[PDB]
Design an enzyme around this catalytic site. Structure first.
Site, PDB file in Angstrom:
ATOM      1  N   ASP A 100      -7.097  -0.726  -2.378  1.00 38.30           N
ATOM      2  CA  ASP A 100      -5.650  -0.638  -2.155  1.00 38.30           C
ATOM      3  C   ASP A 100      -5.317  -0.434  -0.675  1.00 38.30           C
ATOM      4  OD1 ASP A 100      -3.012  -0.729  -2.888  1.00 38.30           O
ATOM      5  OD2 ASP A 100      -2.938   1.279  -3.761  1.00 38.30           O
TER       6      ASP A 100
ATOM      7  N   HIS B   8      -1.921  -4.070 -10.159  1.00 37.50           N
ATOM      8  CA  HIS B   8      -1.614  -2.675  -9.790  1.00 37.50           C
ATOM      9  C   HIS B   8      -0.254  -2.342  -9.206  1.00 37.50           C
ATOM     10  CE1 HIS B   8      -2.729  -3.306  -5.636  1.00 37.50           C
ATOM     11  NE2 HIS B   8      -2.134  -2.144  -5.373  1.00 37.50           N
ATOM     12  N   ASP B   9       0.461  -3.321  -8.619  1.00 35.80           N
ATOM     13  CA  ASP B   9       1.782  -3.064  -8.025  1.00 35.80           C
ATOM     14  C   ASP B   9       2.878  -3.926  -8.642  1.00 35.80           C
ATOM     15  OD1 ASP B   9       1.409  -0.913  -6.156  1.00 35.80           O
ATOM     16  OD2 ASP B   9       0.683  -2.273  -4.628  1.00 35.80           O
TER      17      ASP B   9
ATOM     18  N   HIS C 267       4.534  -4.530  -0.640  1.00 30.84           N
ATOM     19  CA  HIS C 267       4.051  -4.525  -2.033  1.00 30.84           C
ATOM     20  C   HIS C 267       4.521  -5.751  -2.818  1.00 30.84           C
ATOM     21  CE1 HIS C 267       3.693  -0.152  -1.030  1.00 30.84           C
ATOM     22  NE2 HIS C 267       2.497  -0.310  -1.598  1.00 30.84           N
TER      23      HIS C 267
ATOM     24  N   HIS D 157      -0.222  -8.605  -1.070  1.00 32.10           N
ATOM     25  CA  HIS D 157      -0.899  -7.311  -1.117  1.00 32.10           C
ATOM     26  C   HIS D 157      -1.788  -7.196  -2.359  1.00 32.10           C
ATOM     27  CE1 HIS D 157      -1.876  -3.171  -1.305  1.00 32.10           C
ATOM     28  NE2 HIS D 157      -1.131  -2.955  -2.388  1.00 32.10           N
TER      29      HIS D 157
ATOM     30  N   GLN E 287      -0.280   6.735  11.807  1.00 30.32           N
ATOM     31  CA  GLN E 287      -1.429   5.917  11.396  1.00 30.32           C
ATOM     32  C   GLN E 287      -2.748   6.677  11.614  1.00 30.32           C
ATOM     33  OE1 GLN E 287      -1.196   3.659   9.204  1.00 30.32           O
ATOM     34  NE2 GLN E 287      -1.500   1.660  10.118  1.00 30.32           N
TER      35      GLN E 287
HETATM   36  C1  LIG Z   1       2.362   1.609   9.397  1.00 32.36           C
HETATM   37  C2  LIG Z   1       3.408   2.461   8.702  1.00 32.36           C
HETATM   38  C3  LIG Z   1       3.280   3.931   9.104  1.00 32.36           C
HETATM   39  O1  LIG Z   1       2.131   4.425   8.446  1.00 32.36           O
HETATM   40  C4  LIG Z   1       1.864   5.768   8.781  1.00 32.36           C
HETATM   41  C5  LIG Z   1       0.638   6.192   7.953  1.00 32.36           C
HETATM   42  N1  LIG Z   1       0.972   6.374   6.524  1.00 32.36           N
HETATM   43  C6  LIG Z   1       1.541   7.582   6.107  1.00 32.36           C
HETATM   44  O2  LIG Z   1       1.786   8.476   6.913  1.00 32.36           O
HETATM   45  C7  LIG Z   1       1.808   7.707   4.632  1.00 32.36           C
HETATM   46  N2  LIG Z   1       2.340   8.917   4.238  1.00 32.36           N
HETATM   47  C8  LIG Z   1       2.616   9.191   2.828  1.00 32.36           C
HETATM   48  C9  LIG Z   1       1.323   9.312   1.996  1.00 32.36           C
HETATM   49  N3  LIG Z   1       0.875  10.732   1.896  1.00 32.36           N
HETATM   50  C10 LIG Z   1       0.475  11.289   3.221  1.00 32.36           C
HETATM   51  C11 LIG Z   1       0.009  12.742   3.014  1.00 32.36           C
HETATM   52  O3  LIG Z   1      -1.076  12.787   2.129  1.00 32.36           O
HETATM   53  C12 LIG Z   1      -0.754  12.266   0.868  1.00 32.36           C
HETATM   54  C13 LIG Z   1      -0.297  10.803   0.972  1.00 32.36           C
HETATM   55  N4  LIG Z   1       1.568   6.756   3.741  1.00 32.36           N
HETATM   56  C14 LIG Z   1       1.003   5.576   4.238  1.00 32.36           C
HETATM   57  C15 LIG Z   1       0.684   4.546   3.317  1.00 32.36           C
HETATM   58  N5  LIG Z   1       0.096   3.396   3.665  1.00 32.36           N
HETATM   59  C16 LIG Z   1      -0.201   3.211   4.991  1.00 32.36           C
HETATM   60  C17 LIG Z   1      -0.858   1.963   5.365  1.00 32.36           C
HETATM   61  C18 LIG Z   1      -0.697   1.454   6.652  1.00 32.36           C
HETATM   62  C19 LIG Z   1      -1.351   0.294   7.031  1.00 32.36           C
HETATM   63  C20 LIG Z   1      -2.152  -0.338   6.070  1.00 32.36           C
HETATM   64  O4  LIG Z   1      -2.874  -1.468   6.289  1.00 32.36           O
HETATM   65  C21 LIG Z   1      -2.758  -2.055   7.565  1.00 32.36           C
HETATM   66  N6  LIG Z   1      -2.312   0.105   4.782  1.00 32.36           N
HETATM   67  C22 LIG Z   1      -1.657   1.240   4.464  1.00 32.36           C
HETATM   68  C23 LIG Z   1       0.092   4.150   5.973  1.00 32.36           C
HETATM   69  C24 LIG Z   1       0.699   5.356   5.595  1.00 32.36           C
HETATM   70 MG   LIG Z   2       1.089   0.917  -5.606  1.00 33.85          MG
HETATM   71 ZN   LIG Z   3      -1.136  -1.527  -3.777  1.00 30.57          ZN
END
Ligand SMILES: CCCOCCn1c(=O)c(NCCN2CCOCC2)nc2cnc(-c3ccc(OC)nc3)cc21
Ligand SMILES: [Mg+2]
Ligand SMILES: [Zn+2]
Length: 324
Positions: free
Chosen positions: A230, A118-119, A78, A82, A283
Site C-alpha cells: 500500500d 483495497h480502496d 486513491h 494506486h 514525509q
Molecule cells: C506527500 C503528502 C504529505 O505526506 C506527509 C506524510 N504523511 C503523513 O504525515 C500521514 N499522516 C497521517 C497518518 N498517520 C500518521 C501518524 O501515525 C499514524 C498514521 N499520512 C500519510 C499517508 N501517506 C503518505 C504517502 C506519501 C507518499 C507516498 O508515495 C509517494 N505514499 C504515501 C504520506 C503521509
Molecule cells: Mg485505503
Molecule cells: Zn491504498
C-alpha cells in the site's frame, strides 16, 4: 462498456518481462488503461492463479474492468492507478521478493484480489472526514475502519456480480477461506490497525519466533505485507516517488478544501494547502515512524525484498535534503 470488455478479452497479453511488472522500480506513468488491465491479467497468469483456480478468461477480464470502473476518476491518489500499483508491488514482492515461496495458492489469490480491491470507491477523503460529516458509512461501521469496511463491501459486491465471479470454481471451504483472507487484508490497509499490530510482528522477528505455520502469525504477516504494498510508491525511484507524492498531497489538499467549505475549520497541516511548506518534514517524519521499520522487517522476512527498503532509505534522505 461491453466493447471495452470485448477489446480486453480479445487482446494478446504481453509477457511479464515485456510489461516489466517483476521490477520493484515499475512505473505505470507511460501505460494506457488498457495496458494496466493487460498487466493485471499477466499478474494472475504468472502467479498460476488462472490455471490453478480454473478461471474463465472473459470472467477475469470482466472482473478487472468492474474493479477499475469502481475507482473514482475525480480522486487524485486513491484511484485505479494506486490500486493497480499496489497489486503490481504485491506481484513483485511475491516473485522477485520471494514471498510466493512462503504462501499457499489461496493466500496468493486472496492477496492479489485484495491489493486490486483495497480502496474501492474511495471518496478522496479520510475516515475522520466521514465521521465528522456524519456519513451513513461511519454509522454502519461504528466509526471503525469506515472506508476499509466500505472497500471490502464493494469488493464482495463485484465478486458476487453476474459475469464477474472469478471465485466460482473454488470449493466451498476454499471460497470461505479466501473471502476471510480478503476481508482481513483489506481491513489491514487501515494505518491505525497497522500501528496497533506492528509491534507484535517486529517482536516475533527480533526474538527469531517468526513462524508462518502458526495461523495467527500467517494473518499478521498478510496484514503487514498489505501495508508494505500500500505504501510502496514511497520506495520508488525519486522522480516516480516525487510525482506520486504530488498526487497524495493534491488529494489531502482537496479534502482540506472540503473541510473549509463543509466544516468551517482550519484543516490540519497534512490537509492544508496553505501549509504545503510542511510536506518535506512530514514525509521524513512519516518515513521514519511508519515506513522504515516495515521495510526493514519485510527484508528480515525475505532478503530479496531489500529494494523496497533501499528505495525507502534513499527517498527519506532526499526529502530530508529538501526539509533542512
Ligand atoms: C506527500 C503528502 C504529505 O505526506 C506527509 C506524510 N504523511 C503523513 O504525515 C500521514 N499522516 C497521517 C497518518 N498517520 C500518521 C501518524 O501515525 C499514524 C498514521 N499520512 C500519510 C499517508 N501517506 C503518505 C504517502 C506519501 C507518499 C507516498 O508515495 C509517494 N505514499 C504515501 C504520506 C503521509
Ligand atoms: Mg485505503
Ligand atoms: Zn491504498
Amino acid at each position: 462498456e461491453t466493447r471495452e470488455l470485448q477489446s480486453l478479452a480479445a487482446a494478446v497479453v504481453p509477457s511479464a518481462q515485456t510489461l516489466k511488472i517483476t521490477d520493484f522500480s515499475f512505473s505505470d506513468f507511460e501505460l494506457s488503461d488498457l495496458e494496466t488491465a493487460l498487466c493485471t491479467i499477466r499478474m494472475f497468469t504468472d502467479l498460476n492463479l488462472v490455471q490453478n483456480f480454473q478461471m474463465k478468461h472473459e470472467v477475469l477480464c470482466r472482473w478487472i474492468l468492474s474493479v477499475k470502473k469502481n475507482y473514482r476518476k475525480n480522486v487524485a491518489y486513491h484511484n485505479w492507478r494506486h490500486a493497480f500499483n499496489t497489486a503490481q508491488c504485491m506481484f513483485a514482492a511475491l516473485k522477485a521478493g520471494k514471498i510466493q515461496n512462503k504462501l499457499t495458492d489461496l493466500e496468493i489469490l486472496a492477496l492479489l484480489i485484495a491489493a486490486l480491491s483495497h480502496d474501492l470507491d474511495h471518496p478522496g477523503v479520510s475516515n475522520q472526514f466521514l465521521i465528522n460529516t456524519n456519513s451513513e458509512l461511519a454509522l454502519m461501521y461504528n466509526d471503525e475502519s469506515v472506508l476499509e469496511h466500505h472497500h471490502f463491501d464493494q469488493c464482495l459486491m463485484i465478486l458476487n456480480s453476474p459475469g464477474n465471479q472469478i471465485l466460482s470454481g473454488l470449493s466451498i471451504e476454499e471460497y470461505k477461506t479466501t473471502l476471510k483472507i480478503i476481508k482481513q487484508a483489506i481491513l489491514a490497509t487501515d494505518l491505525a490497525l497497522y500501528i496497533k499490530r506492528r509491534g507484535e510482528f517486529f517482536e516475533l522477528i527480533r526474538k527469531n519466533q517468526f513462524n508462518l505455520e502458526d495461523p495467527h502469525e500467517k494473518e499478521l504477516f498478510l496484514a503487514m505485507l498489505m501495508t508494505a504494498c500500500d505504501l510502496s510508491a514511497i520506495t520508488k525511484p525519486w522522480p516516480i516517488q516525487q510525482r506520486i507524492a504530488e498526487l497524495v498531497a493534491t488529494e489531502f489538499f482537496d479534502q482540506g478544501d472540503r473541510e473549509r467549505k463543509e466544516l468551517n475549520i482550519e484543516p490540519t497541516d497534512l490537509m492544508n494547502r496553505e501549509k504545503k511548506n510542511k510536506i518535506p518534514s512530514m514525509q521524513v517524519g512519516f518515513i521514519d515512524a511508519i515506513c522504515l521499520q516495515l521495510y526493514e522487517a519485510l527484508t528480515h522476512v525475505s532478503e530479496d525484498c531489500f529494494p523496497l527498503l533501499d528505495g525507502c532509505r534513499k527517498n527519506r534522505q532526499k526529502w530530508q535534503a529538501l526539509a533542512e
